[model samples]
Target: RMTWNFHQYYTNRNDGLMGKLVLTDEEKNNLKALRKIIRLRTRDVFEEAKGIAKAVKKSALTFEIIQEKVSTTQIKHLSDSEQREVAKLIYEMDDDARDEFLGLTPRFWTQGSFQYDTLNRPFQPGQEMDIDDGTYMPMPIFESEPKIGHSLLILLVDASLKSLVAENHGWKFEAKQTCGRIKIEAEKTHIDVPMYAIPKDGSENVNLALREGDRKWINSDPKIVEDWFNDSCIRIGKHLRKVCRFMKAWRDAQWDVGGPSSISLMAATVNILDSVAHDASDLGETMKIIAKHLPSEFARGVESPDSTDEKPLFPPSYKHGPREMDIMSKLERLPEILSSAESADSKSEALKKINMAFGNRVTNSELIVLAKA
Candidate 1:
């Protein structure tokens, strides 16, 4: 049997158990009015209890919940087995295959967010998780212009990737503007191979250039950018990496089509973290600080940390466009959502606030467990 204790403090006096007491008419009327007032006050107390329960629920929604369940689970990076298999597949391209397609066997290395450990699972449909791999081809020194055009190099890599895709089941090839992409449909992932050219002799003064789909070559070295990001992680707190992932997840949730590029977001985050002095251990606070500053930071345009070039990652024109405006509006709302979560009364309300900023994946039942014990 369930037992509940009831106190009689609301009544000032108690009648004897076996005594039938008679009262005057005025006394009876006064007793009835007192009972009515007590009922009204009791109803108000129940309403206040409901509000109190809601506020207390927010305490259960901790930063660890978001980090462990949401960030580490649903927005996770590639597994070790997948990374190994993909690297082996790319590295094992035989010399014959390379000669027939690429003219020379290109050396491959991983790059971009995958190398930085900021890669996240795709949140939108038709979006594939991307892994960036750099393909460096050795070219003979040209006193004048080289015989091969930039577009030809991209085309050759595209052909090589196409052949590789054909040999494997559930694989598809896409010729992107800057690279050859191999899409593994079964895994909902893709590998982007960006072609680069270096001198065959491997001279000390190496000039590296990336071949683009538009038949243009640009002086670029992905290695420099990779080193810069790694060094920044070491110099700044590693939390900056997590911040990038959170921002990416938010971006994925908000925009189904166009949003800020991942590199631009990474650059913007690093820039913001570098300028602010905050407790690196508190990810939630760090995120709030970044969210508050993101609009202004992006407004100035994000510059590549490794480059001396004046060109920004996203140009001013791109920064002032509709995509940028949409991003700014969402960023403006992020801090408020986080703040609301911190003060929410119920667990469901807190989770909803977080999902509003991040995505539905943050609260997916399969990815997160909210047990009441």
Candidate 2:
């Protein structure tokens, strides 16, 4: 959980009280009595030794003093997920935006001033490398190398919309939060502890250890895997919605907040990307199960016999294709905010559907071949 004050944001929901001055007579009386008795009894009881009671007494005093501060802040009562969400977002908001967020005198907020996106980096390098699988892709694609010139596309579609695309193209990522041992070294030696456990039986391990004493786990079923994958994407999308929903709010903050910047998008994109990567891995393995054991009709099919709007099993967010403009118009007055450059150079299999339908520029008969000529 997160609580924001103009000066410092506090995170510790369910652990801290509302930083409000609204007080009861009992609390006030307790402090008054504590002060009247002085520190003589408590100091003697402890005998100069520090312990829990001492800490509690000291904390009580501090709490009484600051509990009523007009500047105190406590995040709105949110669920565990939402609490973490507020914590995560407040933590991520731009320093200035965050300051504004915290500074509200119990009645203030703005939107879109601090937005986020999945900042993608084109495959650039010292020189162009082979597109084939033999050589490695650059750092950001393979490891945690930093990103550059990051910017958000800022697609504020419905939660259902992102889930639609996630279903189509969420393969190609780390399956779970796989982890390894890291040694912290001051000199040449250090200790290692397990942050994430790698199961030995290929059950979830990249390398399975079949022989010797090993635990057994049938690989997670395809259905479960897909659901998990979808769930992760859904979870992240939920956070993104929060970010998107509050951004314009942040922008319109009481002090006349400014517009969102590229840096803001960069941070948001990075956060989403982290969750997306894991979801992809899950989708890949889950697809293997679905293809191997499940019937074809159980999953999304390549074609359909719909009478209207021929769309992808999963559609793109922006309107570069035929019906995108239509979809955007129907859902929102997108032209009010987006520019042409905002939706450019995106290449995904999902885009193929646009060329098939959704606009006059493309039609299904011209692009699709479900059967032999």
Candidate 3:
């Protein structure tokens, strides 16, 4: 039975398992402010690079401005041969000459699951959410740009342009890949900024990250994957994201056996929410269904009931079947824990069971959210 008062719990389930998907007013303000600053910086740096390229050359040159960054672009308005000639000329700049001409390199880029806005960034008062370890809170990213190259000579650019953009925009140059320490902070406080480059698409049609150790391009599929989640959200309800937030919190609180990555979790949550039958207010049951679905999906591997044999619960980059069984074994225990939580009689009983399942991530001091009708 449903009642009007269920609105509070449905709208602000700060007491429920994952609590509300609400953000503190301050947090929202901070993110938008940072984004605005970065937007200004992107254009300023690109123009400077354009000016330098033109000044050093005898011919006219132009670049197509993408909505955000310079990663996904090619030579503008030139024959293939002319572009290749321009690309080769770009290579002639050498490392020192390149920085001198462009002012700075474009090395800093940002990456995160939140770029798609499919996850929650709920406030936890004193939680402060550790930015370094990528947990609990909405994850912010700060990736370094990768070198870009093209068959075209004069039209070519490298990841260094991103660094130049940062310099022009106002940010210190730091490369932690060589320093052996990766700290997530903005200026002095916690910050979420990233840098990356993909001068051109790879074999998988992805703008891959050129990682350090391997010195090879690997595709994480943030853009395409986010589109999938967003499309799913449109078809299903916005509750899809909230359900993801709940599962994310559970993964942070419980499931310590090296659970799936955030993308993996999002993909799985969307799939489960899409397939299940639900009452409008059945958030708890929806969450449990999410918990119940993954282990089976992981266990099913390539042979699942779904038609998208790409592996339902797996990350988009993963083309193989089920990963190691150890994670699956640990995941198998979660459904039972959620079952205990769902069946508990009183609010206190449910909280206890929920906390127990999550390794007591819910402190006793935390308020209880009842699914009252």
Candidate 4:
């Protein structure tokens, strides 16, 4: 038996509040297939669009045709037989079939808390119901659907490319008065890209988006961050992604009033883990130690003195006031939280304290089973 948030499959689902977030084996493979299809189709569309730009005047910036990008991953946990089957399915896909599978939409979904893998909360007024013949469904009243909001997509282009395309393809891309964002409206396969701009040098690549409707271009390299977690940190024998997910879940449960940015939280969490010269026995221990270290980790800046680390990546607070203190407070109580759960006389009593500490993630019966284990 495990905690309520504990998935029999996805270890990534760390928040116990929303139980049973697992997709079946077939559903898992379907997600991978969708990822592959999106990347392939989007690449083809971008090439055609880039070709049009090149035809007019081959400027250094304009002619740079790039392959489409995706933030999704392959079905890594699949068996060899399953992997072979997935490969065969991808290889045999006709263009028409592939397009139909993706709803004939070539839009790229880039932003959202979901895109960042931080959306851990469940849709309110909902319960899980299993339909016969392997269909998973959520029954709900009132709020039948949950959404983050309209995704922020800001298109940017040089005057030449903007006007050139407008004239050539009758694509009227308009600029927003608010924050220098542009949006295209016409017969176009180019949509769903959250942030688009003229293919310029790296210095102009915009990355950060504000909740206040302003978008900013920064030197924050997502690829750098991704590689740090996916490759370098994973090699260090700590379950880096799992730990990060847990941190995000913890943040979600408690102190979301004024919390740290997801990017900042991810960087700080991984940075602390990397500082540990030795590996912990498990991810739970790694999280406990990370909590134990946040005080000094945010002490001025959590970086080696020998390294030329000038600025603190994980600041004590951003626009949100003293967010780290909120996290630090919970981290301080983590020991008690675990011990209390272990020592409770009854499942319901333990759940009360658990709910106090981390909100209603696990159920009382689930707590009992977890204690028995």
**What TM-score does prediction 4 earn?**
0.46
lDDT (tens digit, per residue) of candidate 3 on 1-373: 4211222233354554444444556765665555455444444544544454544354333332221113322233234454445444453554544443454333333335445553445233222222221101011121442222322111232222233333443433333431111222332223333223333212133333332565433333344554666688898887877766666665655443345655566766666667877644666566666777887665544232223335444433234334445456556777777677656666567666766544454444334445444
Query: What's the CA error at residue 351 for candidate 3, in Å?
Result: 0.9
lDDT value, residue 58 of candidate 4 = 33
Q: Relative to the true structure, how large is the alpha-carbon lDDT of every model?
A: 0.56, 0.23, 0.45, 0.38
Residue 90 in model 1: lDDT? 26
For candidate 1, list the clashing residue pairs, or say none: 54-345, 55-345
Output the better candidate (1/2) by lDDT.
1
Which stretches in model 3 have alpha-carbon errors above 4 Å?
1-21, 58-112, 121-206, 212-221, 255-258, 302-326, 358-373
lDDT score at residue 332, model 2, on the 0-100 scale: 32
Using all chains and alpha carbons, the TM-scores for the candidates as numbered come to: 0.64, 0.14, 0.57, 0.46
TM-score between candidate 1 and the true structure = 0.64
Better of 1 and 3 by lDDT: 1
Error of 3 at 316 (Å): 14
Assess the local accuracy of residue 267 in candidate 1 as a C-alpha lDDT between 0 and 100: 86
Mind giving the per-residue lDDT tens digits that candidate 1 earns over 1-373? 1211101110111321001112335544543443343233323322332232232243433333323332222112223443333223323334443233234445656677767776666767877666776666666644423434343344435445654565578977676766767777766567777766677641332334444343355566777777878888898866666677778877878888778888888888888888987666455567777888877777777788766546787656354777677777776788888767555555566556666876665432222223221
The sequence of per-residue lDDT tens digits that candidate 2 reaches over residues 262-370 is 2232233323344333332222122122222212221222121111214433233442344433333322321212111122233222223221111122212222212
- Whole-structure CA lDDT of model 2: 0.23
Error of 2 at 197 (Å): 15
What are the per-residue Cα lDDT tens digits for candidate 4 across 25-91? 5644543443344345334443333343233233323111211111011222233443343334333
